[PDB]
Each structure stands twice: as structure tokens, then as C-alpha cells.
Amino acid sequence: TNEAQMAAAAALARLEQKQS
Amino acid sequence: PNRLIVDEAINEDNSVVSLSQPKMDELQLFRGDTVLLKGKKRREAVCIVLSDDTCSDEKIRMNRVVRNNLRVRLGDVISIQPCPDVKYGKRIHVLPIDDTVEGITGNLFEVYLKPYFLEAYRPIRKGDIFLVRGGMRAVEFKVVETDPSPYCIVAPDTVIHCEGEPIKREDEEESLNEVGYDDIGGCRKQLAQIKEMVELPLRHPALFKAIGVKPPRGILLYGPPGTGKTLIARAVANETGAFFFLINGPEIMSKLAGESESNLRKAFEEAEKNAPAIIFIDELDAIAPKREKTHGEVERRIVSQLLTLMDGLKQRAHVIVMAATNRPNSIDPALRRFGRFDREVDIGIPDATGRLEILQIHTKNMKLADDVDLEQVANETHGHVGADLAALCSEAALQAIRKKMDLIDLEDETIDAEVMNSLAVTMDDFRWALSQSNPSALRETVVEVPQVTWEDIGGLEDVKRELQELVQYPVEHPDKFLKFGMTPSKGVLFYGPPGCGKTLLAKAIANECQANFISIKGPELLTMWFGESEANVREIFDKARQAAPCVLFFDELDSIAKARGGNIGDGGGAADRVINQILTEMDGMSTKKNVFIIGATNRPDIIDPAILRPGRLDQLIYIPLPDEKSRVAILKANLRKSPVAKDVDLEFLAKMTNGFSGADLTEICQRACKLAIRESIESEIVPEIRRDHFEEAMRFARRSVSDNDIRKYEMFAQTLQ
Amino acid sequence: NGPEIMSKLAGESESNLRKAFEEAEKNAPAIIFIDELDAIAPKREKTHGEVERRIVSQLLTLMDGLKQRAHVIVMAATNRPNSIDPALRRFGRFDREVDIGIPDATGRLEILQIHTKNMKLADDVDLEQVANETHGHVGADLAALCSEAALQAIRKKMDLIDLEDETIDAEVMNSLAVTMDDFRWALSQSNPSALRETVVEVPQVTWEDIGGLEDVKRELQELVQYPVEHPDKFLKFGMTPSKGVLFYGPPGCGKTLLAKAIANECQANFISIKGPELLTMWFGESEANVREIFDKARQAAPCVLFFDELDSIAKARGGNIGDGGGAADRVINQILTEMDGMSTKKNVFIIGATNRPDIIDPAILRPGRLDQLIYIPLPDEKSRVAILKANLRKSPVAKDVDLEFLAKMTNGFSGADLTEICQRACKLAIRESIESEIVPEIRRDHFEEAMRFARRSVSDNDIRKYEMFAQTLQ
Numbered sequence A: 001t002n003e004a005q006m007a008a009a010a011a012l013a014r015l016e017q018k019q020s
Numbered sequence B: 001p002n003r004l005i006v007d008e009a010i011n012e013d014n015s016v017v018s019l020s021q022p023k024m025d026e027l028q029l030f031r032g033d034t035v036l037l038k039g040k041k042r043r044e045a046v047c048i049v050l051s052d053d054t055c056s057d058e059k060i061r062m063n064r065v066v067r068n069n070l071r072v073r074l075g076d077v078i079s080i081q082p083c084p085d086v087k088y089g090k091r092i093h094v095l096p097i098d099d100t101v102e103g104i105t106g107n108l109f110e111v112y113l114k115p116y117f118l119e120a121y122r123p124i125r126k127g128d129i130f131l132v133r134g135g136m137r138a139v140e141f142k143v144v145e146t147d148p149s150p151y152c153i154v155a156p157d158t159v160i161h162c163e164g165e166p167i168k169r170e171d172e173e174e175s176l177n178e179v180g181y182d183d184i185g186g187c188r189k190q191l192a193q194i195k196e197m198v199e200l201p202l203r204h205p206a207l208f209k210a211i212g213v214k215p216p217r218g219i220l221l222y223g224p225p226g227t228g229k230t231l232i233a234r235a236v237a238n239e240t241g242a243f244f245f246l247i248n249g250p251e252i253m254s255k256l257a258g259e260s261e262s263n264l265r266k267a268f269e270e271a272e273k274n275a276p277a278i279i280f281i282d283e284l285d286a287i288a289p290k291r292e293k294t295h296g297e298v299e300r301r302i303v304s305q306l307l308t309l310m311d312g313l314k315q316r317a318h319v320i321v322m323a324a325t326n327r328p329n330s331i332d333p334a335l336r337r338f339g340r341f342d343r344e345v346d347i348g349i350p351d352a353t354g355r356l357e358i359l360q361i362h363t364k365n366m367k368l369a370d371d372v373d374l375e376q377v378a379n380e381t382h383g384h385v386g387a388d389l390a391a392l393c394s395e396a397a398l399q400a401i402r403k404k405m406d407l408i409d410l411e412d413e414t415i416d417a418e419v420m421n422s423l424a425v426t427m428d429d430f431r432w433a434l435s436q437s438n439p440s441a442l443r444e445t446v447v448e449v450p451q452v453t454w455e456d457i458g459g460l461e462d463v464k465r466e467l468q469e470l471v472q473y474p475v476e477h478p479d480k481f482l483k484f485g486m487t488p489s490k491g492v493l494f495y496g497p498p499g500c501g502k503t504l505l506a507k508a509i510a511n512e513c514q515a516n517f518i519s520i521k522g523p524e525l526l527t528m529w530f531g532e533s534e535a536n537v538r539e540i541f542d543k544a545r546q547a548a549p550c551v552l553f554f555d556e557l558d559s560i561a562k563a564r565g566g567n568i569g570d571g572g573g574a575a576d577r578v579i580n581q582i583l584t585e586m587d588g589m590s591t592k593k594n595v596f597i598i599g600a601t602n603r604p605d606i607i608d609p610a611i612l613r614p615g616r617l618d619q620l621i622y623i624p625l626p627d628e629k630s631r632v633a634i635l636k637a638n639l640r641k642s643p644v645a646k647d648v649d650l651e652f653l654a655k656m657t658n659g660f661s662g663a664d665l666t667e668i669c670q671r672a673c674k675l676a677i678r679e680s681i682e683s684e685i686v687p688e689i690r691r692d693h694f695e696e697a698m699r700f701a702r703r704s705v706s707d708n709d710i711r712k713y714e715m716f717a718q719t720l721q
Numbered sequence C: 001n002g003p004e005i006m007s008k009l010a011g012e013s014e015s016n017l018r019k020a021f022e023e024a025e026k027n028a029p030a031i032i033f034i035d036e037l038d039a040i041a042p043k044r045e046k047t048h049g050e051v052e053r054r055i056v057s058q059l060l061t062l063m064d065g066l067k068q069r070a071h072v073i074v075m076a077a078t079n080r081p082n083s084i085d086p087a088l089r090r091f092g093r094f095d096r097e098v099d100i101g102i103p104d105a106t107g108r109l110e111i112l113q114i115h116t117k118n119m120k121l122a123d124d125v126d127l128e129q130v131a132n133e134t135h136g137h138v139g140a141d142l143a144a145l146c147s148e149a150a151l152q153a154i155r156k157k158m159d160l161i162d163l164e165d166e167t168i169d170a171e172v173m174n175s176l177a178v179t180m181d182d183f184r185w186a187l188s189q190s191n192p193s194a195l196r197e198t199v200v201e202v203p204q205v206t207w208e209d210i211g212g213l214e215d216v217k218r219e220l221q222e223l224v225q226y227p228v229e230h231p232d233k234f235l236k237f238g239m240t241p242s243k244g245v246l247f248y249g250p251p252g253c254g255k256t257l258l259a260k261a262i263a264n265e266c267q268a269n270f271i272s273i274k275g276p277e278l279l280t281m282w283f284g285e286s287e288a289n290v291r292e293i294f295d296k297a298r299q300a301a302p303c304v305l306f307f308d309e310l311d312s313i314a315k316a317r318g319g320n321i322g323d324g325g326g327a328a329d330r331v332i333n334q335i336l337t338e339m340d341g342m343s344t345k346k347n348v349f350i351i352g353a354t355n356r357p358d359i360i361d362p363a364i365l366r367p368g369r370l371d372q373l374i375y376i377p378l379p380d381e382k383s384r385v386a387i388l389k390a391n392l393r394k395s396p397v398a399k400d401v402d403l404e405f406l407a408k409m410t411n412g413f414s415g416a417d418l419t420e421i422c423q424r425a426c427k428l429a430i431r432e433s434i435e436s437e438i439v440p441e442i443r444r445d446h447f448e449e450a451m452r453f454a455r456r457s458v459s460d461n462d463i464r465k466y467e468m469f470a471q472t473l474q
């Protein structure tokens, strides 16, 4: 659903900023 | 149905799990959807599913925080279901756990929770425990009240409250700061091997009771001190839940006759009562040294006592004994006989990649400044082990604290959270720690997967391809080798002038093959002969067999022939004790163990011909000094890291430096780079390397290979036709 | 077991050892098994403690007490029969002994079949392949191999269906098969415990694997087969059968295959002694190992004991120059002694090989020792063709390959050099086949290219020396 996709976008931003 | 095996995750995030696509299609969920996880004791967690190319189809990957909330351990299985009806929350109440709020005060919400939840859109559930790292502390929080229930997503526009005394930890949950697998940096391959051996016997004892298979009952770990031998043994016990019993040689041996044997027996008896359990015996070579090296009655007795207790593990259900030593051949061989300690793992020393991982692990809570470069540190910390890298991180943290915080805080027990979080550790603090620390393992052999690629080698286009045919084809296309009755070569010997890339060739093929590179030097072969310790030859080949896939590189292969006289010597041949053991170990090595042997020599005319027979280093490759086109390639390759001015004529330099080896061309480029860097720094007290920097570098660079040495190598290569 | 007895205090170890014998008598008939015997009764020179000496004497007296303890047999296990107190082997006590050794390829297959009786195997599983690949493994390694292969299959299926309970549904195990990839995976993870042990078995080299040398093949049959196939004819004519033959000539002409092939046809155990072993015994002043080698040959009889690189010791001493002494040394003295003491009817035949017979103590060739000598020259035109055909018997070869033409070119080549050409042509065919996927057989172009890289290993200076030596021997 839509609130879950916004949660996924936030998790992906955190993981990429810290891992890359 | 919809059940997945719990395993570790690469993503550290407190709300992220990873599935392989075939399970996402069967579960009818898409990347980014929210799912619910059902574990044990009526406990659930809410998370977002992503995907990667590392999770297997049958597994679900998650971090420690999710496993703790579900009251599950690695190897367990949980149910997964999508929940597309998840909506945003309105108000939540989150409080810290007392276990971590020790010596810290101030507005914990503004320091930890608000950065953690603000624009984070994290799914939460009532009772969820999560860890927020920062300010050199790791503080965990619990969700105690939510307006929606049982789960919701925390949006930046929701109200987050945090009022009340810290919560006392419940007996159904463990502290998230306890040692686990995510605290082990280098030697990840070794940890994976151990997990396969230990996790299943302990996590699912029912399967071994019913199925006609025998569990491992003893694993010997060996390597230098400070590499993580005791960290692995404890981390395994903590992750599986088995009771951890600690034994060490010198303490048991410090006891009186009769007391040392009684204490050793008690530890085994307690493990059975508390089974499943793991018994860790440190300094095994101290408690049970080789009997043929002992003299006393007590020394022989304590060895026999351990041998009987190890054998008694057939009756002591679910008890696995692990041991640590510095050298696998410093313990009585009886311990390594079938049964007892029938498995061993080579921990060794972390390589440059492992060292970076360790530095990252011991900085989890540290706020690093933009100038901090842990990869640069990992490359400088040669000879360091995890014990030394941990010291470097703590020392850098202390220096940052003394410079800033001692001008703010008093000599007291409690510090404001805001002051701690406001502190960043700079590169100067790490460099200071590097000046204070001294590597504890500088001389021991280090096994590493090399970072040398084919693009790093100038010239030798045909040799690079030849190695791929020698090393990759036997395993990439085994059906063609069988079809034509071909016996794959077990190794190749390189010969020619020094500094032409022999080392890069062996590393580059190991790199593409993702294989461990083991460097053996002449001094090791020479020491074995003169010290009458040829048994160390087996240790070298055994390391390769356990490190497989690997490339075992024997430098200075001529060292044995030279030790016998080389140019003159006696009236005999090149055969000797050391080469005889080397040849024996090679002949007994199977090509299916993915171990390839590469040799190098600067005096091929005196190599024992036995090593060139079929089954040994039968292939010969000549590596001459680079030619005109190769020298240009070498110069340009070395300069890929620094802009080169348009006034630099690299082809001219290659045409002049006719007697220079690849090693000498590298010095020219690196020296010109240093000169350009110096000028750049001085300009602020430049963007590219200018012709003046190369012309100055040429004033110091010299050829390392003389004209007579070249003729010797060319005449030999011609003799072989 | 040793550790259980030795861990006990002075007086407790002796009492416990005595009780074990008393219990066997009370429950007779009984068998007592003492494992790790060398841990309780090691060779005397290896222990001096008062407690260790007494427990050895206690075992010796308990063994002698078996004259009264009717119907009690004591068995013991050790790693080496010569690591224990020699007194144990006196008439009675532990006078009888059996060499268990290690399994060969046939035995390993039987062991794998036993430890898989309860295992569900997939149709692709081939235990004969495993038995042939598991070189250096013992039964305990093959049992571990079966366990590891099962554990891999179990993790794939048992954890997949999440059968987490105290009992396993029989239906799950019934369909839980172990595949060939699970055995091959386990083989990569396992590590043979007997990889460095001496392997004594009937070799797989046949006469069809050796090109040329038709007369040498017959000569070995007369020397090795006839003395035992026609023992009455040797007696009737007063023949003294030869106990061994030495091979000499250029290297790479099949000296080793000849010794193995005759051992194979005779179904005799082949024992390979190589230069490195002869060198170790000389360099380390451990010539006692020679007696152990010949003693194993006797135990393994019928057998063929092959001593390769007989000249390795002469070379170690300086070969052509050396010191001011002669051709005697510690190791050759023991070898010659064991030859002279070898019983004619023990069915132990000795074969030697050297590339430099002129520097080996001629005493080794006296009657009763290596009295027969066979010259193995470089193969001739018809033999080189036969060698090429044998080497290529395992690969597809195109009809355009003219093996007689190639053999005519390689006039100075040894059999070892013809093999290099064959393997090079195979490698080239493999390279061509692999590239075609980015071919079905080896083409003449692959042999013609290989011909330009191979060279003769034996120069004319060595052949003339070999011919002159052969001429001296008539």
C-alpha cells in the first residue's frame, strides 16, 4: 500500500546514505 | 505455509528484512510492502520487505533487533504475511531501557528518538525494542503506548512522547549490546563454516536425535592472539543460547596435582547439567601440550584426563567443546584423532578488507567527522589484529572526548546526552592512536583475497590470458577436459628479471577467481631446511587446502637450490629434504580442491628439474622486462589516480627508460605524484602533475636490472626455445 | 582404553586394569579390547617413570594370567605395531597380530554402501565415483562423508518445510534424497586423515597401457610369473629363480609402468619406493626404515617392491666425485642385507630402476639380488606409434591425424615426450571447443602445433653413454 511504500523509500535512503 | 528460515541480514536497519524474489511472488507482496512476522511465545514484529541477490529462496534475512523482538534465534523459522492495511500512527510513547541509560542524562528524545523517527516512516509495534546508536553510546528503547494498535507507521507529523523512569529489562528479552555475530569483522568465511557445524546441533537437537548422523563434538580454532578466537566461541554461544563455560590452560595448570584434574572434570559435568552447552578451552597447547614434549607425571595425567572427557561427549548429550591455540601443531596429536577435536578452522589474521570491517564495527556508536577515512586506516594498519584495531577506535574516541568534553563536563559519573552527541572524532585523533599502537602480529603469514585486477598490470597481454586458461578453465568447463582426457596443470613457474609483475600476475588471477592469496617467501623455505623443521611444509599446503579456493604462491623457488650451493655446491643434484616434502604434498593434492600453485624464480637455470615434471610446475612462462608499448601502459596505469598535465610526454619517457623494469616505472610515476602533491600543499601556505615533476623524478629514478642480468635471462629463454 | 587407565592415580590404574580382567573371567567367555595400547604399554625406551613402568608390568602379568582365566581373549589396537613394549609379543600374550591397514578403492565403495543403507539416494548418486575420488580416506572419513552429505540435503529440505518438533514425520525422510552434488560438496569440505600414509594395493596399470617393449613384457612374465606358475619345472631342471631385476636406460621410457603392469597381471600388491624416501633415509641417518619397508613387502606378499631412483643416494654423496671414500653407505647396507635374507618362497619380487647405473654399488647386482638387468632404450618407430595410440585411447581423435607421420618426426623423443605432445593437442582441442561456445575431436592442426613446442628430453650425449653401458653388459 501507499504508506508502506513511503516507509520503504525512507528505509532505502537510510541504508544507501550509510552503506555507500 | 509461508514459513521462512531466520538468518543474518546485510542491511542493519531495525525495520528491514530481505527476501528472494520467488518468495515475494508466492507471498503476493511487492518491494516496499509492509509485512508482519510471527515468532515465538505470541510475539510479533512489523517490517518492510526489500530484496537482494544474496538471500536464498528458503531464508528470510533480518538483523538482531528483529530476532530479539520475535524471541527467535538464528536457525529458527517464522511465519510471514503481508498487511497492506497498515496506516500512520497519531501518538506513541517510547521510553529507554535502564540497562543502557547508565552515566547519561539530558533530553534523550531530542538526541536519539527524534533523529531516529523524524522523516524515517518506520513501522512499529507495541512492545518493540529497537536500538539507536550515537554519541559513543548505544541506547535501546521500548514502545509502551500507541493510539493505533497493534502496529502503525510513525510519520514525521505524529506525536512522540518520552516521560518516565527508564524501563527495567524483562526476563523474556536480551540486551541488544550483547556480543553476537555482527560484532565479528574479518574471518567471515570462517564464521560461516563454524555456523554450519554448530548452529544446527544446538538449535534443533531433535533432528540429530532422530536422524542417523553424528554432530561435531569439538572444533579447534587457531591463529595469533587478538584475532577473535574467543570472540567467535562466545558469539556462537550467545546466538544459539547454549551455556558458555570458560576454561584456560594456565589457570588449570596453576592448580595443585589433583586439583587441576578435578576442576577440568567439573567443567564438563556442569556442561551436561546445563546442556545444550559449549565448553571453550583457551590456550589448549598449555593445558594439553604434546606428551612427547613433556616430562612430568602431572603433564601426562592432565592430557589423559582431557582425552577421556572429550571421548565422554558421546554420552553428554548436546555438549560441543571448542578450543583455541596459536599453532595447530602445538597440541598432542591424540586430541585431533577421529572424534574429540575432529574439526578445525584457520582464523589467521584479518586482511585489509577485514580490518576495515573491524574498524567499522568498533565505530558503530562513534560520530565520525567528514575527514575520517577508515579505509586509509585499514591500509596503514599492517600487522594489526582485531585487538589492536579495537584499541585504535577507543583511543580515537578518548582523544575527541578530552579535547572538547573536558572543557564542558565535570569529573563525575553522568554526562548530558546532547554534549556526547555533539562530539565528532576527526582523522587527527585516529592518526594519533595509530602512533600509539603497535601491531601484535606483524610477522605471521596473512592470507588475503587480493585487490589486484588485470587492469593493474601493464603489458603481458598473453600471460594474463594464459593464466585464465590454466586456472579458470579446469573448473569453468570441466566437461571439455574430461571429453579430451586432459589432465589439468596444478601450477606454473614464472622466471625472468625482477620487478616485471610476477606478483601481480598471481594476485590478479586470484582476484578474478575470488580466491585467497597465500604468499610464501624464500626465507620460509630456507628456515625449514636449516632448522630441520620440514614438517612446516605440510602446514603451508594444509593452509592452502583449508583456505581453498586459493592460489599458493611460492616466491624465490631457487632458494633451495642456492642453499645447496646454487652456482657451485657439491657433486650431487638439487634434491633435498624440503623440496622432497614439497613434491610429496603437491602430488597428493587434488585439482578438485580449487588450489592452484604458482612459483617464481630469478634463477631458473638452477631449479630442481623435479618441480617441472607433469603434476608439478610443468608450465614455464617467461616474464621479460616490458617493451616500448608495455612501458607506456605501465606508466599510464600508475597515473590513473592523478591527473596528468598535457605537457607530460609519457611515450617519450617509455622510449628513454629502456632498461627500466615495471617496478622502476612505478617509482617514476609515484615520485612525480609526490612532487605534485607537495606543490599543491605549499600553494595554500597543483591540480595535475606537470612535466617539471616528471623531469625532477627522473633525476632520482634508476634501472634496477643491469645489462648483464638481462642477457642472462634472454639467453636462458632462448635455450628453452 | 589408554587414557582411561593412565589418567588414574598410582595404584588406581593398576587396580582398575586388574578388575577388567577379573570381570572378563567372571563373565567368561569374554573379550577384552584395549584401545590405544601404545598409551599404556609404549616401547620401554620411551618411558622412565615408576608409575608408567609398573602399569606395563601389570599388563604383562595379567596377560600371562590368561592361562587360568579360561575362555578370555584379549584384543588390542595400536597405530604402529613397533610402538609398544616388545615383551607383549612373546609366545602367548599378544603373539598373534593382524594388519588392518587402509581400504583400497573396492573396500571404500563397500564402506560407503554400508553407511548409506538407511540413506535415500537420488538417481544421480554414484558411489563408485566417490570411492575412486576418496584417495587417502579411511572408513571413519567415509562415514563422516556420508554424514556431511546427508546434513546438506537435510538443511535443504528439512528446514525448508519447517519440521520443527521432537519427532520427524517418516514421510519427510522417505522423500529426502541425497544428490551427487551433496556428496561432491561434502568431498570438498572433508579432509583425508591417511593422505600421507603408504598405499599398498594392486595397481591398475595394464600391458595395453605401455607402448612397445614387447620383449621386455615377456621377460618380466618369465621372471615373475613362471617361478610360481610352474614351480615343479624350476625344481626339475635345477633352476635358481631370480629375486629381482634392475632397469636402466634413458628416463621417461616406461620403467615405472613396466613394474606396475606385471604387478597388476599377477594380482600382486605394488609398493612404490621413490627417490625422496631413499634420500630421507640417507640424509636423516634412519636406515632402520629399510627393514620396515622390506617387512611390509613380506606382509603384503605376494607383492612387487619397486625401488625407483636407486642412484639418488649416490648423487647425494656427490655422484661422480663426492668425498674420498667408496660406494657404501648406511642405507645400501640395509637394503643389501634385506635382499640376502629374503625367502625365495615368500613371493616377494624386487624391481629397481636407475638412470645412472654406473654409480650404484655393483654389489647390488650379485646373484641372489638384482642379478637381472634390462635395457629400456628410446622407443623405435613402431613403438612410438603404439605409445601415441595408447596415450590417445581416452580421447576422440580425428581421422586426419597421421600418427605414423608424427612418430617419424619425433625420432629422438622418449615416451614421456610423446605424452606431452598428446596432452598439448588435447589442450588445444579444449581451447578451440570452449571458444566455439563464445571441436568434437582433436584435429591434425592441434597435433601439428603441439609438435612445435615439444622437445626431446634425452640428448645424444646421454644415449651414447647408455649404449656403451649396455654393450659392456652384453
Ligand SMILES: Nc1ncnc2c1ncn2[C@@H]1O[C@H](COP(=O)(O)OP(=O)(O)O)[C@@H](O)[C@H]1O
Pocket (backbone or CB within 6 Å): B183, B184, B185, B186, B187, B225, B226, B227, B228, B229, B230, B231, B350, B358, B361, B385, B386, B387, B388, B390
Ligand atoms: N575478528 C574480530 N572482529 C571484531 N572484533 C574483534 C576481532 N578480534 C578481536 N576483536 C576485538 O578485540 C578484543 C579482543 O579481546 P578478547 O575478547 O579478550 O580476545 P582475545 O582472546 O584475543 O584476548 C575485543 O574487544 C573484540 O571485540
Ligand SMILES: Nc1ncnc2c1ncn2[C@@H]1O[C@H](COP(=O)(O)OP(=O)(O)O)[C@@H](O)[C@H]1O
Pocket (backbone or CB within 6 Å): B456, B457, B458, B459, B460, B497, B498, B499, B500, B501, B502, B503, B504, B626, B634, B637, B661, B662, B663, B664, B666
Ligand atoms: N607489469 C607491471 N605493471 C605494473 N606495475 C608493475 C609491473 N611490474 C612491476 N610493477 C610494480 O613493481 C612492484 C614490484 O612487483 P613484484 O612483482 O612484486 O616484483 P618482485 O616480486 O619481482 O620483487 C609492484 O608493486 C608493481 O607496482
Ligand SMILES: Nc1ncnc2c1ncn2[C@@H]1O[C@H](COP(=O)(O)OP(=O)(O)O)[C@@H](O)[C@H]1O
Pocket (backbone or CB within 6 Å): C209, C210, C211, C212, C213, C251, C252, C253, C254, C255, C256, C257, C353, C379, C387, C390, C391, C414, C415, C416, C417, C419
Ligand atoms: N612405453 C610407453 N608407453 C606409454 N607411455 C609411456 C611409455 N614410456 C613413457 N611413457 C609416459 O611417460 C611417463 C613417465 O613414465 P615413467 O616410467 O613414470 O618414467 P620414470 O620411470 O622415468 O619416472 C608416463 O606417465 C607415461 O605416460
